[PDB]
Amino acid sequence: GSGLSNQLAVTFREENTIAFRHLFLLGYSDGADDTFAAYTREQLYQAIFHAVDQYLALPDVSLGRYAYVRGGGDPWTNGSGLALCQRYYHRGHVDPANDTFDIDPMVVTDCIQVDPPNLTLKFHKLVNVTIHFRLKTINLQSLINNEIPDCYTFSVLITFDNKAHSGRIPISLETQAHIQECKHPSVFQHG
Amino acid sequence: GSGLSNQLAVTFREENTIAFRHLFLLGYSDGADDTFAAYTREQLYQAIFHAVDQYLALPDVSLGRYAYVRGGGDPWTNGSGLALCQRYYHRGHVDPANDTFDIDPMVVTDCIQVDPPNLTLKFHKLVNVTIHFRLKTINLQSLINNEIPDCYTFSVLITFDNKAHSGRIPISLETQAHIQECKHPSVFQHG
Amino acid sequence: GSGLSNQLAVTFREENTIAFRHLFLLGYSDGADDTFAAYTREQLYQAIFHAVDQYLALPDVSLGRYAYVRGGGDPWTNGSGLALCQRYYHRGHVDPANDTFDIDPMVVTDCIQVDPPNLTLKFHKLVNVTIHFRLKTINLQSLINNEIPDCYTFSVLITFDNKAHSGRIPISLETQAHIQECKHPSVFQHG
Amino acid sequence: GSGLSNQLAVTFREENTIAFRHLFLLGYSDGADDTFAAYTREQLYQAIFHAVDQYLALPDVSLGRYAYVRGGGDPWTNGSGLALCQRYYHRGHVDPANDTFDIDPMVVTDCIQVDPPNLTLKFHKLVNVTIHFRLKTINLQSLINNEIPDCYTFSVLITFDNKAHSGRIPISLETQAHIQECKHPSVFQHG
């Protein structure tokens, strides 16, 4: 009943999240979560594009059934499903060879909008790169616990964090889950 | 003698089972048991077919000597060695884009019979896919403990579980062992 | 001095042994010792041949300097460096399909001799396959502890164990070390 | 403030160091630090060259911004960025086949100088091979803790250790960090 309903819901959120890591993170394998990172530019660009591409090809490859979500204040412009954002110092003259730098640390955010069916990164002044998108899905497992399937909206955030400017960029994927009743649920139930 | 006979028997069952995982599970490696899963359709189809194909090519690749078993009530029709079954909701209209669904949760089981020497999966309404088959083998190790080799029948069940409808499908292989005396065992024993 | 001399010697034996596993065991990686095994015939033949071939190509690929050893009662015939042995039941009619077998458990050992610069395995009656060879090397590290380098003879035994007849064949490599003074050691030592 | 400043600095040093391992060590993966080693000559030469080449291509592949450093007494001749050194016994006649050796254990160091924009190893008398180079970088993360970015000089030492003459050559990368104020730091800071 209820204690089970909660565990099933948490489990549903974790399983989807694990699925998202395998689908969107290039070269991801279980147990690699806090070491997973990019070390070269090619790796980073390959990781960034693979994630956007897997987002576009989702209906054709995923074992789940997800609906795209469009709109919202940040940072999806209208019509937008995926936001590929770039944060860097407004001014970042960095010259270790002469032991100097000149910096305006105000952070600028450039975001590219991608609507569900090119990028020039600023490495020396890059704070980070994020990929934001939402996916909706029905929680069918509920039927086993004799409950009406729920309506989930997963907010997915992939972060390529360069805040340490260490030559190592850890990559992570996190999800927030908004749960509500579906508009029209119908489960035939007599026999 | 006897305490050893039991441990040897358990060990025999576990070793065969581990062998089955390496032979029938595509991409399997030790220590991956409870994380092993499919995340895309291609992976899933590739996993399903590899298992059936390895079953067909068994006599030509295995380091063991297994005999195929035919018949039985469920779910082998007569003449059948391997049953590839599919379980899905009788009715499963699932539309997250419009927050609705319409479901008849009665489970339907479609099984394909494969006789020892094409598949269309229903992802949005798929409960699971199973592969059932039996293999017989002689337990020769018994000779070391000065015992007459036993006759084992291994019932193998491979499950691709989609009950969580999470986008992640864990894959597992389990075995049940039926043990009995062989019809005619002969071990020359004088010298 | 002496406590160090012993640890250095043990360490020398372990390092060489670890090196032997990487050189002679096909697909070997650290930490895989008690799970390392073959599951198909191709794997097994590929493992067996790779070991013999690496033995033949040793002078051209190893980071160490090993001398081959010839002779000895078992199982090197004279002129022999490597013995590839096969043990199987003198008689092993094994027919699980009809639940019978007929066995003469006397073990027969067929060994092929390979002299430092084809195989037909009996799977259903195979007890095991071994590869035996000896390598000599000088223990130079001794110089650090101000000692005269030692003369080591490593007896290497690789076993592909099928005694469980489980479809799984664990593969292992073990070494015995015979240590003695070298015939003529000379370490210039004035400055 | 200060407790954070220290942890951030230590973390900065560790992250850069981890980055160096992924960039310069051929085939490196996390968690492999004390087992990482070469077992054949090809592996060793491939490891040595990959490290030098990655040093030369650094500006084009790294996610960080490093400046090369030239000069210094040991072992960079002037104009030198990378020193590829070789240490071996002045005299090392090693003949295990006849159980003898003749050695002059005085160590000779041959170093090749590489200036930022062929090798013949002596395996039987090789003590080790080292690769020494320095890289400078600005510690930008400091801005988060409202501090002026620091000027770091990383001294990188890669060691291919053959002192055990065991056939196994462990490979490691270590760093020393020299920290000082930058010549001219400027961080605009009003708004």
From Swiss-Prot, chains A, B, C, D:
Comment text on domains: The most N-terminal extracellular/lumenal domain (referred to as I-II linker or polycystin-mucolipin domain) contributes to a structure with a four-fold rotational symmetry in a tetrameric assembly; the structure contains a central highly electronegative pore with a 14 A diameter. The pore is critical for Ca(2+) and pH regulation. The protruding structure formed by the I-II linkers may contain all the interaction sites with lipids and proteins in the endolysosomal lumen.
Disulfide linkage: C85-C111, C151-C182
Tissues expressing this chain: Widely expressed in adult and fetal tissues.
Gene of this entry: MCOLN1
Protein name: Mucolipin-1
Superkingdom field: Eukaryota
Residues carrying a glycan: N128
Similarity comment: family membership: Belongs to the transient receptor (TC 1.A.4) family. Polycystin subfamily. MCOLN1 sub-subfamily.
Stretches assigned to the Extracellular side: 6-191
Outcome of swapping L157P: In LECD; uncertain significance
Function: Nonselective cation channel probably playing a role in the regulation of membrane trafficking events and of metal homeostasis. Acts as a Ca(2+)-permeable cation channel with inwardly rectifying activity. Proposed to play a major role in Ca(2+) release from late endosome and lysosome vesicles to the cytoplasm, which is important for many lysosome-dependent cellular events, including the fusion and trafficking of these organelles, exocytosis and autophagy. Required for efficient uptake of large particles in macrophages in which Ca(2+) release from the lysosomes triggers lysosomal exocytosis. May contribute to cellular lipase activity within the late endosomal pathway or at the cell surface which may be involved in processes of membrane reshaping and vesiculation, especially the growth of tubular structures. However, it is not known, whether it conveys the enzymatic activity directly, or merely facilitates the activity of an associated phospholipase.
Compartmental location: Late endosome membrane; Lysosome membrane; Cytoplasmic vesicle membrane; Cell projection, Phagocytic cup
Subunit architecture: Homotetramer. Homooligomer. Can heterooligomerize with MCOLN2 or MCOLN3; heteromeric assemblies have different channel properties as compared to the respective homooligomers and may be tissue-specific. Interacts with PDCD6. Interacts with TMEM163. Interacts with LAPTM4B.
Connected disease: Mucolipidosis 4: An autosomal recessive lysosomal storage disorder characterized by severe psychomotor retardation and ophthalmologic abnormalities, including corneal opacity, retinal degeneration and strabismus. Storage bodies of lipids and water-soluble substances are seen by electron microscopy in almost every cell type of the patients. Most patients are unable to speak or walk independently and reach a maximal developmental level of 1-2 years. All patients have constitutive achlorhydia associated with a secondary elevation of serum gastrin levels.
UniProt-reported outcome of changing L63K: Disrupts tetrameric assembly and abolishes lysosomal localization
PTM entry text: Palmitoylated; involved in association with membranes. Phosphorylation by PKA inhibits channel activity. Dephosphorylation increases activity.
Species: Homo sapiens (Human)
Effect of D30Q: Modulates inhibition by Ca(2+) at different pH levels but does not abolish channel inward rectification
Region Extracellular/lumenal pore loop, annotated ranges: 26-40
Effect of Y28G: Abolishes formation and extrusion of tubulo-vesicular structures and decreases lysosomal exocytosis when overexpressed
